Amino acid sequence: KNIQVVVRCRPFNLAERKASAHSIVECDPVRKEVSVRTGGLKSSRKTYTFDMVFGASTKQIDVYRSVVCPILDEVIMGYNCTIFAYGQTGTGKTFTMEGERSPNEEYTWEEDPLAGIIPRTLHQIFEKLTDNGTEFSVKVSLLEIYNEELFDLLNPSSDVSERLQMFDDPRNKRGVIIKGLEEITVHNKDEVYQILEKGAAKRTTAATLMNAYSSRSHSVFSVTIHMKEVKIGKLNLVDLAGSENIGRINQSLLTLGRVITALVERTPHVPYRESKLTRILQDSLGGRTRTSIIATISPASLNLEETLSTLEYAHRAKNILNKPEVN
Numbered sequence: 001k002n003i004q005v006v007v008r009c010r011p012f013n014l015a016e017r018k019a020s021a022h023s024i025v026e027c028d029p030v031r032k033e034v035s036v037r038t039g040g041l042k043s044s045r046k047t048y049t050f051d052m053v054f055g056a057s058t059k060q061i062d063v064y065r066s067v068v069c070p071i072l073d074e075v076i077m078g079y080n081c082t083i084f085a086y087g088q089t090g091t092g093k094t095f096t097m098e099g100e101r102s103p104n105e106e107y108t109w110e111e112d113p114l115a116g117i118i119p120r121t122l123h124q125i126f127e128k129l130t131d132n133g134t135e136f137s138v139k140v141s142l143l144e145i146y147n148e149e150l151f152d153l154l155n156p157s158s159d160v161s162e163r164l165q166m167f168d169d170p171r172n173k174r175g176v177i178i179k180g181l182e183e184i185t186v187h188n189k190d191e192v193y194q195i196l197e198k199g200a201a202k203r204t205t206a207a208t209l210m211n212a213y214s215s216r217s218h219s220v221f222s223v224t225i226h227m228k229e230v231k232i233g234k235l236n237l238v239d240l241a242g243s244e245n246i247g248r249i250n251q252s253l254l255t256l257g258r259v260i261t262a263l264v265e266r267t268p269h270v271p272y273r274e275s276k277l278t279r280i281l282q283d284s285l286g287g288r289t290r291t292s293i294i295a296t297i298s299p300a301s302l303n304l305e306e307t308l309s310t311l312e313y314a315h316r317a318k319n320i321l322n323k324p325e326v327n
């Protein structure tokens with residue numbers, strides 16, 4: 001199975017209106033195409049084909065149903081799966097993965113239309129497996145990488161500033177062990193909320209200590225499911241550092257790009273080992289994990305170069321061949 005790649009374009013924001021930008025992106029969900037006007041105010045265009053394309057009016061629940069549900073079914077069959085969010089800062093990586101609370105409304109978080117992939121997925125795991133006849137346990141962890149240092153965001157009994165260490169898994173060699181990373185047992189929906197709420201608070205604190213934390217950090221959220229025979233499924237959701245930090249500094253972003261390139265061009269040495277991120281997610285790039293990428297872009301003319309760079313990177317990635325296998 002090739003890595004599945006989809007593109008999500010967000011609506012114009014106000015900064016873009018204030019810069020007097022115009023729209024240079026057209027999404028065609030039916031043909032699964034996105035075309036970008038490369039000229040200026042018609043003049044030339046590039047068209048890319050992806051596995052799916054979501055336009056500016058795409059709702060959170062549409063992304064979840066079309067992209068994540070099929071993947072969650074594989075996880076429950078006992079596969080490992082990974083979804084990346086990739087793209088320029090401000091294009092919707094975090095909105096897609098986590099979402100938001102609807103403002104002047106109350107919804108419970110379980111029913112809030114702005115909820116993203118993670119809340120929905122966690123809600124549905126308990127929902128599906130309870131109805132199934134059950135016999136399952138769920139644990140979650142959240143690690144962030146900033147300037148090639150690992151932080152555990154979910155450990156309540158720990159300062160956010162304490163970094164973790166990693167070493168290779170003796171008996172895996174294609175995965176690593178992260179010393180001290182808390183894998184927290186989640187007993188139900190309500191506990192999910194309080195656990196991740198503390199995580200959000202620690203993030204806030206980390207941002208006061210580190211420059212441009214939210215745009216330069218990589219976030220890896222993992223949920224592991226044990227089911228009584230299924231048996232063991234794992235889902236990794238990765239919110240990557242803003243893609244403008246490279247293009248055409250951030251060692252993990254850099255190496256991820258080289259790993260993609262090496263895999264597509266079939267070069268002999270794939271440099272997994274040159275960054276924390278690619279060491280952690282090695283099995284997701286050319287391994288036995290089923291992987292999807294969500295590439296987020298801006299519609300606006302002033303982001304032309306970053307949008308093209310994102311679409312080129314995403315387009316190449318879908319040539320990577322994975323070979324999924326159940327745990």
Ligand SMILES: Cc1ccc(C(=O)N(CCCN)[C@@H](c2nn3ccc(Cl)c3c(=O)n2Cc2ccccc2)C2CC2)cc1
Pocket residue numbers: 094097098099100101102108109110112114115116118119122142192193194196197199200221
């Ligand atoms: C419906 C809804 C959606 C999102 C939020 C929210 O803003 N949050 C904090 C900041 C978001 N960047 C939430 C949040 N935090 N968080 C830290 C790391 C990660 Cl990963 C997440 C994440 O996935 N969420 C979403 C979530 C997850 C489970 C249940 C409900 C919402 C926070 C209240 C929990 C609050 C309510």
Ligand SMILES: Nc1ncnc2c1ncn2[C@@H]1O[C@H](COP(=O)(O)OP(=O)(O)O)[C@@H](O)[C@H]1O
Pocket residue numbers: 009010011056087088089090091092093094095096100296
């Ligand atoms: N599809 C979308 N529709 C409406 N608003 C969006 C969409 N994607 C992102 N936004 C908003 O744009 C801003 C930045 O999104 P964000 O997820 O933080 O970007 P990123 O994580 O890639 O830096 C926030 O206001 C966010 O809610």
Ligand SMILES: [Mg+2]
Pocket residue numbers: 093094095214215
């Ligand atoms: Mg973000």
Ligand SMILES: [Mg+2]
Pocket residue numbers: 213214215216217218219239240241242
């Ligand atoms: Mg980040």
